[PDB]
Amino acid sequence: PMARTRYGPVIGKVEQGALAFKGIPYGAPTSGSGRFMPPTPPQPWSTPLRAFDYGPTAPQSDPQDALESGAADARESEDCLTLNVWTPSLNDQRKRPVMVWLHGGGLWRLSAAGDYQAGTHLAAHSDVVMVSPNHRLNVLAHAYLDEYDPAFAGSSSAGMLDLVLALKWVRDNIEEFGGDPDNVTIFGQSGGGQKVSFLMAMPAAAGLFHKAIIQSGPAPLALEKPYARELSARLLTLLDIPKNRVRDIQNVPLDAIMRAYYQIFEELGVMGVIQDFAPVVDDVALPQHPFWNGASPLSRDVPLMIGCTRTEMTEYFLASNPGAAKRDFAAVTAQLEPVFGMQAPAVVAHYRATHPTASPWEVDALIRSDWPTRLFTQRIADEQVKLGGAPVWMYRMDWQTTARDGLLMSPHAIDIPFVLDTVGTEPVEPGQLAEQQRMMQQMNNAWVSFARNGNPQNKYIPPWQPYNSTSRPTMIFNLHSHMANDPDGSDLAFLKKDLANLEVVAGGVTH
């Protein structure tokens, strides 16, 4: 299938009734004079480009690990501004909803590739157009070089401006791929939800999307200049670049950049509390924290669907602490001291009181899901509804896998196949295939109805009232779903009493 773009024609493939285009360039290479600068459109091509394969992965690996190892090369590249489109049709003016998927991996890892997150089924089954861009990550995306040379104003948001350029590509081109440029939903999980959070406050992105979904990935805070300065000072020193000649950083080899990055990454961590290279409140690309000090009025009229899973961090914590599920309550408390300090026994005691039949592992799992994911999720929703504009829809995903003897429960990312209609691409435990298909039918139809109609209600779930910050009505997704007011609300209330004294972002937030 041949489609036209502003920069030249592309050829896709027919896959399962849908048209699939992979690796379409939307920006120029970012090496050389593009490094730590905003993206630019690509140079146009004349003959049709075969968009048959995913584009290059953004640089993210440690060059030390690739030496004397037996892994297939990742083929990471600074020429990574490509995107994928899955669509039922080309330029027929039927104005299908456009769902722009922002991949996960914090702001630092991964890519849009992989069966579990392909848009084939969404396109063929739901008559939507799905777009997923790659973009710069980690230090190439978010180095704070503004104060070294005026040319680098906004540098810590370069990787977010990549996504803005991808959204301009959609505006200018999606009609050729059967989509409505006036009905664009941005959505993402984990780091993808963090990317949605930042875009909601970015002046450059305003008007380029109309709806937003944040799935297990709140970012109500950015970095502030003091801590970002410390990161970029270390980067320049480790690369032997004096403050005076910072532009020379654009011509050092990529390996030297990535080695220095990991040098810094080592000497520095609960997920969701940002401490790596990230966007800065810099008054150029990002004028405020996304939500902590108030939601941006830029997105007052953007409806938002937002939520998280019940036990987000079980798999991640076990993968970092394989014997963790054996701990008793004293050990659970002791290993929460780095997070809650003096208040760790009080927190564990509170959760034992509100969950009196929960094991130590289950208590620990609820605490580590609530802090920071569910607390931050609630904060974003509270700040958005305070704008008094478009509605907000809150959910919590409570379905449990039986994996690893019941220890995982409702972990991070387990619901990606439910929302994307890709069940089977991820593990399925014996006796749970029909359950996952039922979870998909409920959640996929909610995502699609939100994109198509502006309201997630659908015939497979009960009526879903918009969120407010007094009774806090929340959709509980499970094999049979149901609304609940302020689910386990006293747990978050307890954490909020201690909030002024917890680390919420590296370097803190000015008030």
Short mmCIF file of C-alpha atoms in Angstrom, two decimals:
data_model
loop_
_atom_site.label_atom_id
_atom_site.label_comp_id
_atom_site.label_asym_id
_atom_site.label_seq_id
_atom_site.Cartn_x
_atom_site.Cartn_y
_atom_site.Cartn_z
CA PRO A 1 0.00 0.00 0.00
CA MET A 2 1.40 3.41 -1.05
CA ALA A 3 0.68 6.51 1.05
CA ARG A 4 1.81 10.09 0.49
CA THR A 5 3.55 12.13 3.17
CA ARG A 6 4.64 15.76 3.21
CA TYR A 7 8.24 14.50 2.80
CA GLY A 8 7.65 11.76 0.22
CA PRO A 9 5.77 8.55 -0.53
CA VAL A 10 5.90 5.45 1.67
CA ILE A 11 4.94 1.81 1.03
CA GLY A 12 3.37 -0.30 3.75
CA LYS A 13 2.22 -3.90 4.03
CA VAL A 14 -1.24 -5.40 4.45
CA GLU A 15 -1.36 -7.26 7.77
CA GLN A 16 -4.49 -8.96 9.16
CA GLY A 17 -6.81 -6.62 7.24
CA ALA A 18 -4.95 -3.45 8.26
CA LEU A 19 -2.26 -1.38 6.55
CA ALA A 20 1.01 -1.34 8.50
CA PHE A 21 3.77 1.26 8.00
CA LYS A 22 6.94 1.01 10.10
CA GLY A 23 9.90 3.34 10.36
CA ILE A 24 8.50 6.42 8.58
CA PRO A 25 10.93 9.34 9.10
CA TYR A 26 9.36 12.33 10.83
CA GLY A 27 12.59 14.13 11.80
CA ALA A 28 16.16 14.62 10.63
CA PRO A 29 19.13 12.80 12.24
CA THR A 30 19.98 14.22 15.67
CA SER A 31 23.78 13.69 15.61
CA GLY A 32 26.24 16.53 15.01
CA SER A 33 24.66 19.98 14.92
CA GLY A 34 21.35 18.35 15.90
CA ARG A 35 22.69 16.99 19.19
CA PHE A 36 20.91 18.38 22.29
CA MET A 37 18.93 20.69 19.92
CA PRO A 38 15.25 20.54 18.94
CA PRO A 39 14.33 18.21 16.07
CA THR A 40 13.78 19.41 12.52
CA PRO A 41 11.73 17.85 9.72
CA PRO A 42 13.56 15.31 7.56
CA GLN A 43 14.96 16.00 4.15
CA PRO A 44 12.34 14.87 1.61
CA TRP A 45 12.74 11.76 -0.52
CA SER A 46 11.61 11.28 -4.11
CA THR A 47 11.25 7.61 -4.64
CA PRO A 48 8.90 5.58 -2.39
CA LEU A 49 10.42 4.51 0.91
CA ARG A 50 9.69 0.92 1.94
CA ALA A 51 8.29 1.26 5.46
CA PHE A 52 8.58 -2.42 6.23
CA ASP A 53 10.69 -2.48 9.42
CA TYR A 54 10.78 -0.70 12.77
CA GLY A 55 13.24 2.19 12.75
CA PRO A 56 16.43 2.48 14.80
CA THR A 57 16.25 2.26 18.58
CA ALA A 58 17.27 5.43 20.42
CA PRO A 59 20.73 5.21 22.06
CA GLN A 60 20.39 3.72 25.52
CA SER A 61 22.83 0.83 26.05
CA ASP A 62 26.10 0.86 27.98
CA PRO A 63 28.96 0.57 25.43
CA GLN A 64 30.90 -1.52 27.97
CA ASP A 65 28.24 -4.25 27.92
CA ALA A 66 28.46 -4.60 24.13
CA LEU A 67 32.19 -5.41 24.26
CA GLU A 68 33.17 -9.10 24.40
CA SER A 69 29.50 -10.11 24.67
CA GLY A 70 27.32 -12.48 22.67
CA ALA A 71 24.11 -10.45 22.35
CA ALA A 72 22.81 -9.34 18.97
CA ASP A 73 23.68 -5.69 18.37
CA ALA A 74 20.77 -3.37 19.15
CA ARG A 75 21.57 -1.07 16.19
CA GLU A 76 20.79 2.01 18.26
CA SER A 77 21.29 5.27 16.40
CA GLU A 78 20.95 9.03 16.74
CA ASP A 79 18.87 8.82 13.53
CA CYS A 80 15.88 7.58 15.51
CA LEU A 81 13.03 10.00 14.70
CA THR A 82 10.76 7.51 12.92
CA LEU A 83 7.18 6.48 13.62
CA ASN A 84 4.83 3.59 12.88
CA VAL A 85 1.26 3.83 11.57
CA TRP A 86 -1.42 1.12 11.56
CA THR A 87 -4.65 2.05 9.76
CA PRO A 88 -7.69 0.42 8.14
CA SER A 89 -7.50 2.80 5.17
CA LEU A 90 -5.73 5.58 3.28
CA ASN A 91 -7.10 8.99 2.18
CA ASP A 92 -10.85 8.33 2.25
CA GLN A 93 -11.80 11.27 4.53
CA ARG A 94 -13.70 9.03 7.00
CA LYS A 95 -12.01 10.82 9.94
CA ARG A 96 -11.24 7.82 12.15
CA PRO A 97 -10.00 8.53 15.70
CA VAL A 98 -6.20 8.77 15.92
CA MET A 99 -4.52 7.18 18.94
CA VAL A 100 -0.89 8.19 19.37
CA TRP A 101 0.85 5.60 21.56
CA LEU A 102 3.89 6.80 23.55
CA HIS A 103 6.08 3.86 24.46
CA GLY A 104 7.25 2.99 27.96
CA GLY A 105 10.60 2.54 29.65
CA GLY A 106 10.62 5.66 31.78
CA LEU A 107 12.14 8.52 29.80
CA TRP A 108 15.28 6.45 29.32
CA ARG A 109 14.78 2.98 27.70
CA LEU A 110 13.00 0.80 25.12
CA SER A 111 11.14 1.73 21.93
CA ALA A 112 7.87 1.36 20.05
CA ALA A 113 8.81 -2.06 18.60
CA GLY A 114 7.30 -5.39 19.64
CA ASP A 115 4.15 -7.47 19.09
CA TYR A 116 2.70 -6.64 22.49
CA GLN A 117 2.33 -2.97 21.48
CA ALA A 118 1.64 -3.18 17.71
CA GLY A 119 -1.44 -1.36 16.45
CA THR A 120 -2.63 -4.05 14.00
CA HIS A 121 -5.61 -5.27 16.02
CA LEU A 122 -6.73 -1.78 17.07
CA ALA A 123 -6.75 -0.75 13.42
CA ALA A 124 -8.53 -3.76 11.94
CA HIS A 125 -10.98 -4.45 14.77
CA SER A 126 -11.78 -0.97 16.09
CA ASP A 127 -11.43 1.19 12.95
CA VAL A 128 -8.91 3.49 14.60
CA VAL A 129 -5.58 4.81 13.37
CA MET A 130 -2.70 4.04 15.78
CA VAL A 131 0.60 5.95 15.56
CA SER A 132 3.66 5.16 17.67
CA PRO A 133 6.83 7.29 17.44
CA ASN A 134 10.35 6.63 18.56
CA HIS A 135 12.24 9.65 19.95
CA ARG A 136 15.41 10.55 21.84
CA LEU A 137 15.79 9.15 25.37
CA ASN A 138 17.82 9.73 28.55
CA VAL A 139 20.85 12.04 28.18
CA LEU A 140 20.39 12.78 24.45
CA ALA A 141 16.80 13.81 25.23
CA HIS A 142 17.15 15.70 28.51
CA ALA A 143 20.63 17.21 29.06
CA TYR A 144 20.28 20.64 30.70
CA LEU A 145 22.78 22.74 28.74
CA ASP A 146 20.82 26.05 28.68
CA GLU A 147 23.15 28.00 30.95
CA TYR A 148 26.35 27.02 29.10
CA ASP A 149 25.39 28.44 25.69
CA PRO A 150 22.25 30.33 24.57
CA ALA A 151 21.84 28.02 21.56
CA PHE A 152 20.81 25.21 23.94
CA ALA A 153 17.80 26.92 25.52
CA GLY A 154 15.22 24.18 26.06
CA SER A 155 17.77 21.35 25.64
CA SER A 156 16.38 19.33 28.56
CA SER A 157 13.11 18.92 26.63
CA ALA A 158 14.66 17.98 23.25
CA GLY A 159 13.23 14.47 23.50
CA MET A 160 9.75 15.84 24.32
CA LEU A 161 9.99 18.26 21.38
CA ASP A 162 10.62 15.15 19.27
CA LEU A 163 7.12 14.01 20.27
CA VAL A 164 5.75 17.46 19.43
CA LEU A 165 7.23 17.14 15.94
CA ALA A 166 5.61 13.69 15.69
CA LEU A 167 2.28 15.28 16.62
CA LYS A 168 2.82 17.95 13.91
CA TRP A 169 3.45 15.07 11.51
CA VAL A 170 0.03 13.65 12.50
CA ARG A 171 -1.67 17.03 12.00
CA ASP A 172 -0.20 17.40 8.52
CA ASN A 173 -0.29 13.77 7.33
CA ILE A 174 -2.84 11.56 9.10
CA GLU A 175 -5.66 12.30 6.62
CA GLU A 176 -3.56 10.37 4.09
CA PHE A 177 -3.72 7.41 6.52
CA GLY A 178 -7.51 7.60 7.02
CA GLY A 179 -7.43 9.56 10.28
CA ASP A 180 -9.04 12.68 11.72
CA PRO A 181 -6.38 15.29 12.63
CA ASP A 182 -9.05 16.97 14.79
CA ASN A 183 -9.53 13.88 17.03
CA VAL A 184 -6.06 12.88 18.35
CA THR A 185 -5.69 11.01 21.65
CA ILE A 186 -2.23 10.72 23.22
CA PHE A 187 -1.85 7.70 25.46
CA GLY A 188 0.90 5.81 27.15
CA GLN A 189 1.80 3.44 29.94
CA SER A 190 4.64 3.85 32.50
CA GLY A 191 7.22 6.17 30.88
CA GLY A 192 4.61 6.67 28.16
CA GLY A 193 2.23 8.07 30.76
CA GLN A 194 5.03 10.32 32.02
CA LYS A 195 5.48 11.60 28.45
CA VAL A 196 1.72 12.33 28.25
CA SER A 197 2.02 14.20 31.57
CA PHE A 198 4.79 16.48 30.24
CA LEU A 199 3.00 17.16 26.93
CA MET A 200 -0.11 18.35 28.79
CA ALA A 201 1.91 21.33 30.13
CA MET A 202 4.06 22.13 27.08
CA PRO A 203 3.08 25.26 25.10
CA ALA A 204 4.62 23.79 21.93
CA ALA A 205 2.19 20.85 22.06
CA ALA A 206 -1.02 22.78 22.68
CA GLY A 207 -3.68 22.13 20.04
CA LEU A 208 -1.88 19.07 18.65
CA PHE A 209 -3.92 16.63 20.73
CA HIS A 210 -7.46 16.65 22.06
CA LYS A 211 -7.63 13.81 24.62
CA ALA A 212 -5.15 12.09 26.92
CA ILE A 213 -4.77 8.77 28.75
CA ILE A 214 -2.21 8.20 31.53
CA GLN A 215 -1.90 4.48 32.36
CA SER A 216 0.28 3.60 35.38
CA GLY A 217 2.61 6.53 34.77
CA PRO A 218 2.01 9.86 36.49
CA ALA A 219 4.63 12.64 36.22
CA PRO A 220 3.27 15.60 38.20
CA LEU A 221 6.84 16.94 38.67
CA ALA A 222 9.81 17.84 36.48
CA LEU A 223 13.37 18.52 37.61
CA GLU A 224 14.31 21.98 38.82
CA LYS A 225 17.46 23.78 37.71
CA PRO A 226 19.74 23.15 40.78
CA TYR A 227 19.71 19.35 40.42
CA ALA A 228 19.68 19.38 36.62
CA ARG A 229 22.77 21.65 36.67
CA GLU A 230 24.58 19.10 38.83
CA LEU A 231 23.80 16.36 36.31
CA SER A 232 25.01 18.30 33.29
CA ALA A 233 28.11 19.57 35.14
CA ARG A 234 29.11 15.94 35.79
CA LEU A 235 28.45 15.07 32.15
CA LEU A 236 30.72 17.82 30.79
CA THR A 237 33.49 17.04 33.31
CA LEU A 238 33.45 13.32 32.51
CA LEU A 239 33.66 14.14 28.78
CA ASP A 240 36.61 16.55 29.29
CA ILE A 241 34.66 19.51 27.85
CA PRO A 242 35.20 22.92 29.49
CA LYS A 243 32.17 25.07 30.32
CA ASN A 244 33.45 27.60 27.78
CA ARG A 245 33.37 25.31 24.75
CA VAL A 246 30.21 23.32 25.44
CA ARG A 247 29.39 23.17 21.71
CA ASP A 248 32.20 20.61 21.34
CA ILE A 249 29.85 18.10 23.03
CA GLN A 250 28.06 17.87 19.68
CA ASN A 251 31.04 16.24 17.96
CA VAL A 252 32.29 13.72 20.56
CA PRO A 253 31.54 10.07 19.67
CA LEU A 254 28.21 8.64 20.77
CA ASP A 255 29.98 5.90 22.75
CA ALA A 256 31.72 8.54 24.88
CA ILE A 257 28.34 10.18 25.62
CA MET A 258 26.71 6.90 26.59
CA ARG A 259 29.67 5.82 28.74
CA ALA A 260 29.57 9.11 30.66
CA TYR A 261 25.80 8.73 31.11
CA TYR A 262 26.17 5.34 32.78
CA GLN A 263 29.00 6.68 34.93
CA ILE A 264 26.49 9.18 36.33
CA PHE A 265 23.64 6.64 36.41
CA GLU A 266 25.74 4.37 38.64
CA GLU A 267 26.49 7.05 41.25
CA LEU A 268 22.74 7.56 41.75
CA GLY A 269 15.63 5.21 43.45
CA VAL A 270 11.95 4.30 43.54
CA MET A 271 10.27 4.37 40.14
CA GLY A 272 8.08 7.40 39.55
CA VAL A 273 10.24 9.74 41.64
CA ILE A 274 12.39 11.25 38.93
CA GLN A 275 16.15 11.41 39.52
CA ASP A 276 17.74 10.74 36.10
CA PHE A 277 18.11 13.22 33.22
CA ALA A 278 14.60 14.58 32.65
CA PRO A 279 12.81 17.75 31.51
CA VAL A 280 13.50 20.84 33.61
CA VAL A 281 11.18 23.68 34.52
CA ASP A 282 13.16 26.01 32.25
CA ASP A 283 10.68 28.73 31.11
CA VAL A 284 11.40 27.87 27.44
CA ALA A 285 9.91 24.46 26.69
CA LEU A 286 8.38 23.70 30.11
CA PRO A 287 7.04 26.70 32.08
CA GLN A 288 5.76 24.77 35.12
CA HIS A 289 5.79 21.42 36.79
CA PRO A 290 3.14 19.38 34.88
CA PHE A 291 0.66 19.18 37.79
CA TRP A 292 2.21 19.55 41.29
CA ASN A 293 1.65 23.31 41.57
CA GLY A 294 -1.53 23.24 39.51
CA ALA A 295 -2.54 21.76 36.17
CA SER A 296 -1.60 23.68 33.05
CA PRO A 297 -4.54 25.71 31.68
CA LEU A 298 -3.26 24.71 28.21
CA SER A 299 -5.09 21.37 28.66
CA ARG A 300 -8.21 22.66 30.46
CA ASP A 301 -10.39 21.29 27.66
CA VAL A 302 -8.53 17.99 27.17
CA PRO A 303 -10.57 15.09 28.65
CA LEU A 304 -8.31 12.78 30.68
CA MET A 305 -8.57 9.08 31.57
CA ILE A 306 -6.05 8.07 34.23
CA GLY A 307 -5.38 5.18 36.57
CA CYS A 308 -3.01 2.48 37.75
CA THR A 309 -2.92 -1.16 38.87
CA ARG A 310 -3.48 -2.31 42.43
CA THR A 311 0.05 -3.73 43.10
CA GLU A 312 2.24 -1.94 40.57
CA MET A 313 5.68 -2.86 41.86
CA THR A 314 5.49 -6.58 42.79
CA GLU A 315 7.39 -7.85 39.75
CA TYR A 316 9.94 -5.03 39.82
CA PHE A 317 10.62 -5.40 43.53
CA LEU A 318 10.97 -9.19 43.28
CA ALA A 319 13.31 -8.78 40.29
CA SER A 320 15.49 -6.53 42.47
CA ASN A 321 15.03 -8.54 45.69
CA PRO A 322 14.30 -12.15 44.71
CA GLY A 323 13.84 -13.40 48.30
CA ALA A 324 11.62 -10.48 49.28
CA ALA A 325 8.40 -12.48 49.50
CA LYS A 326 9.77 -14.39 52.53
CA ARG A 327 10.18 -11.30 54.74
CA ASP A 328 8.26 -10.83 57.99
CA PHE A 329 6.67 -7.53 59.07
CA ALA A 330 9.83 -6.31 60.83
CA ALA A 331 11.91 -6.79 57.67
CA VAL A 332 9.22 -5.15 55.53
CA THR A 333 9.34 -2.15 57.89
CA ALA A 334 13.15 -1.99 57.95
CA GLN A 335 13.35 -2.01 54.14
CA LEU A 336 10.91 0.91 53.94
CA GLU A 337 13.13 3.14 56.12
CA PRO A 338 15.04 4.52 53.06
CA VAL A 339 11.65 5.73 51.72
CA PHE A 340 9.65 6.74 54.81
CA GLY A 341 12.45 7.15 57.35
CA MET A 342 11.17 7.60 60.90
CA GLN A 343 7.57 7.04 59.76
CA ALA A 344 8.11 3.55 58.29
CA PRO A 345 6.60 1.68 61.30
CA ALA A 346 3.59 4.00 61.31
CA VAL A 347 2.96 3.41 57.60
CA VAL A 348 3.21 -0.38 57.90
CA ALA A 349 0.97 -0.33 60.97
CA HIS A 350 -1.66 1.71 59.13
CA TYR A 351 -1.80 -0.70 56.19
CA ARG A 352 -1.93 -3.66 58.56
CA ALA A 353 -4.95 -2.02 60.20
CA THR A 354 -6.86 -1.39 56.95
CA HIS A 355 -5.82 -4.77 55.44
CA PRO A 356 -5.88 -7.04 58.51
CA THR A 357 -5.86 -10.32 56.53
CA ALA A 358 -3.01 -9.28 54.19
CA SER A 359 0.35 -11.04 54.41
CA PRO A 360 3.59 -9.02 54.84
CA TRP A 361 4.18 -9.31 51.09
CA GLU A 362 0.69 -8.05 50.27
CA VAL A 363 1.01 -5.15 52.74
CA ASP A 364 4.41 -4.24 51.26
CA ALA A 365 2.97 -4.45 47.75
CA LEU A 366 0.12 -2.03 48.52
CA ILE A 367 2.51 0.49 50.10
CA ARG A 368 4.96 0.33 47.18
CA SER A 369 2.14 0.71 44.65
CA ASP A 370 0.61 3.65 46.53
CA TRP A 371 3.94 5.43 46.95
CA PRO A 372 4.39 7.07 44.58
CA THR A 373 2.26 5.69 41.72
CA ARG A 374 -1.28 5.83 43.12
CA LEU A 375 -0.69 8.96 45.22
CA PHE A 376 0.80 10.73 42.17
CA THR A 377 -2.04 9.40 40.01
CA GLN A 378 -4.59 10.90 42.40
CA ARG A 379 -2.66 14.19 42.52
CA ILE A 380 -2.80 14.59 38.74
CA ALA A 381 -6.51 13.83 38.66
CA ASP A 382 -7.21 16.24 41.55
CA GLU A 383 -5.28 19.03 39.85
CA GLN A 384 -6.95 18.50 36.47
CA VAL A 385 -10.51 18.50 37.83
CA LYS A 386 -9.68 21.76 39.64
CA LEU A 387 -9.42 23.43 36.21
CA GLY A 388 -13.19 23.09 35.90
CA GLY A 389 -13.01 22.07 32.25
CA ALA A 390 -13.13 18.71 30.54
CA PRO A 391 -14.01 15.61 32.58
CA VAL A 392 -11.53 13.24 34.17
CA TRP A 393 -12.15 9.48 34.39
CA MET A 394 -10.32 7.51 37.14
CA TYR A 395 -9.78 3.75 37.31
CA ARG A 396 -7.89 1.16 39.31
CA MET A 397 -6.99 -2.18 37.66
CA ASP A 398 -7.62 -4.97 40.21
CA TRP A 399 -7.56 -8.14 38.07
CA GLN A 400 -4.94 -10.60 39.36
CA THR A 401 -2.70 -13.01 37.48
CA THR A 402 -1.91 -16.31 39.20
CA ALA A 403 1.75 -16.01 38.11
CA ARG A 404 4.56 -16.97 40.47
CA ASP A 405 2.33 -18.64 43.03
CA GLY A 406 0.08 -15.60 43.51
CA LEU A 407 2.94 -13.20 44.31
CA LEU A 408 2.53 -10.80 41.37
CA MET A 409 -1.21 -10.01 41.80
CA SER A 410 -1.82 -6.85 39.66
CA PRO A 411 1.63 -5.76 38.43
CA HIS A 412 2.77 -2.88 36.26
CA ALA A 413 2.12 -3.28 32.49
CA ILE A 414 -0.01 -6.43 32.82
CA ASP A 415 -2.90 -4.46 31.27
CA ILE A 416 -1.11 -3.29 28.08
CA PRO A 417 -2.52 -6.28 26.11
CA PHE A 418 -5.97 -5.52 27.53
CA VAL A 419 -6.05 -1.95 26.25
CA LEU A 420 -4.28 -2.63 22.94
CA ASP A 421 -6.16 -5.86 22.01
CA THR A 422 -2.91 -7.92 21.99
CA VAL A 423 -3.77 -10.73 24.44
CA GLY A 424 -1.45 -13.71 23.94
CA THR A 425 1.69 -11.66 23.26
CA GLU A 426 2.48 -11.72 27.01
CA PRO A 427 2.36 -14.68 29.44
CA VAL A 428 -0.99 -16.32 30.08
CA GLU A 429 -1.33 -18.60 33.08
CA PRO A 430 -3.26 -21.89 32.89
CA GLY A 431 -6.98 -21.21 33.18
CA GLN A 432 -6.65 -17.44 32.59
CA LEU A 433 -6.93 -17.05 28.80
CA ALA A 434 -10.69 -16.43 28.95
CA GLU A 435 -10.10 -14.07 31.88
CA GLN A 436 -7.57 -11.99 29.93
CA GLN A 437 -9.89 -11.91 26.90
CA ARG A 438 -12.63 -10.60 29.23
CA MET A 439 -10.31 -7.98 30.70
CA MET A 440 -9.44 -6.94 27.12
CA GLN A 441 -13.07 -6.68 26.06
CA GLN A 442 -13.76 -4.26 28.94
CA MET A 443 -10.61 -2.14 28.81
CA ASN A 444 -10.01 -2.04 25.05
CA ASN A 445 -13.60 -0.91 24.51
CA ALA A 446 -13.12 1.79 27.16
CA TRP A 447 -9.96 3.09 25.45
CA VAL A 448 -11.59 2.99 21.99
CA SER A 449 -14.84 4.63 23.14
CA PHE A 450 -12.84 7.38 24.84
CA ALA A 451 -10.94 7.99 21.59
CA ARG A 452 -14.01 7.77 19.33
CA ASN A 453 -16.78 9.31 21.42
CA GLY A 454 -15.04 11.28 24.19
CA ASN A 455 -16.47 9.03 26.96
CA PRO A 456 -15.12 5.59 28.01
CA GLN A 457 -18.55 4.09 28.72
CA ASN A 458 -19.29 0.89 26.81
CA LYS A 459 -21.66 -2.04 27.01
CA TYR A 460 -19.17 -4.34 28.78
CA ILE A 461 -18.78 -2.18 31.91
CA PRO A 462 -21.20 -0.32 34.21
CA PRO A 463 -21.84 3.42 33.90
CA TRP A 464 -18.66 5.35 34.73
CA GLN A 465 -19.09 8.73 36.47
CA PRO A 466 -16.32 11.34 36.04
CA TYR A 467 -13.90 11.85 38.88
CA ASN A 468 -14.12 14.52 41.58
CA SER A 469 -11.85 15.24 44.55
CA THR A 470 -14.48 14.88 47.30
CA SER A 471 -16.11 11.45 46.86
CA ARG A 472 -13.48 10.30 44.31
CA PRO A 473 -15.59 7.88 42.21
CA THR A 474 -13.31 5.31 40.59
CA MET A 475 -13.92 2.51 38.09
CA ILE A 476 -12.56 -0.78 39.50
CA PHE A 477 -11.59 -2.95 36.51
CA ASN A 478 -11.87 -6.70 37.17
CA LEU A 479 -13.60 -9.70 35.60
CA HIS A 480 -16.75 -7.89 36.67
CA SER A 481 -16.08 -4.18 37.00
CA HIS A 482 -17.75 -1.70 39.31
CA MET A 483 -17.63 1.88 40.55
CA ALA A 484 -16.28 2.57 44.05
CA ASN A 485 -16.04 5.86 45.95
CA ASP A 486 -12.50 6.61 47.20
CA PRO A 487 -11.21 3.00 47.07
CA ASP A 488 -8.83 2.36 49.98
CA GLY A 489 -8.82 6.12 50.35
CA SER A 490 -7.60 6.20 53.96
CA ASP A 491 -4.32 4.61 52.81
CA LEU A 492 -3.57 7.54 50.50
CA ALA A 493 -4.79 9.98 53.16
CA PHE A 494 -2.20 8.55 55.58
CA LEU A 495 0.59 9.01 53.03
CA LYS A 496 -0.57 12.56 52.30
CA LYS A 497 -0.10 13.53 55.99
CA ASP A 498 3.59 12.77 55.53
CA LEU A 499 3.98 14.26 52.04
CA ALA A 500 5.77 17.54 52.80
CA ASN A 501 8.59 15.36 54.23
CA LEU A 502 8.98 12.66 51.51
CA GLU A 503 11.24 12.88 48.45
CA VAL A 504 8.93 13.59 45.52
CA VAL A 505 11.58 14.58 42.93
CA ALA A 506 15.37 14.64 43.04
CA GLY A 507 16.40 18.09 44.21
CA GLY A 508 12.93 18.90 45.53
CA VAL A 509 10.15 21.22 44.37
CA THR A 510 10.09 24.95 45.13
CA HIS A 511 6.94 26.37 46.71
#
